């Protein structure tokens, strides 16, 4: 799958 994962800018 070529899904979007979070850009991890916030958590």
């Amino acid at each position, epitope marked *: 799958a070529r899904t979007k994962q*979070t850009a*991890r*800018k916030s958590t």
Partner: antibody
Amino acid sequence: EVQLVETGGGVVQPGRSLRLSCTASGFTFRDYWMSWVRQAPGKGLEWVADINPDGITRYYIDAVKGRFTISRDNAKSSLYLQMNSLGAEDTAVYYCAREFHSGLGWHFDLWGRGTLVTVSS
Amino acid sequence: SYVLTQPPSVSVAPGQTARITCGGTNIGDISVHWYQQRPGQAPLVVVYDDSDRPSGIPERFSGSNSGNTATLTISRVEAGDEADYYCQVWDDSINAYVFGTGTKVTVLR
């Protein structure tokens, strides 16, 4: 003086291509994330794409996927937007914007005057 | 794609206090920024990181964010505050900057 100057705007026929340039001056350009933000006449703000300082990380909205490509020349202090397969939904003023982060969140702390892009025959 | 709901209009008498709403599910958990846009002008940040104020921005602009609503507050509204105001977040799920639809400040007379 700290400013951004968009250029390369104008009239383009549907299906055709346009390349925008943004020239930065007055600050260290290679230190910042840079974005393109657009605004259709009488409408709201829409972020388009952005690129990281090294030029390897890039994000796009779905509306411009596979049509728009963002790039930068850190030596020229310049940002570029390559726009292919334009339609009327792309007609807008295009803004060059600098991104700001300070351990909390991301916003735009600098804008150019914008360049008008008219997609019409 | 995360949704920000703004009222299209806010009315205020001169010298009074304007309140502009940005609505989102748990928008209090994420940071919100505010832009003023005058006619024919590029947008300008007036509040960032929920409540912080850029240098050069008058103290009349303040911000807050809690629960499901962020709020831009403009106190003693004067000549020059008549403008469009946009709330903004970064959606870290689909990875895009998101703007509100915008709120026009109208002066009551």
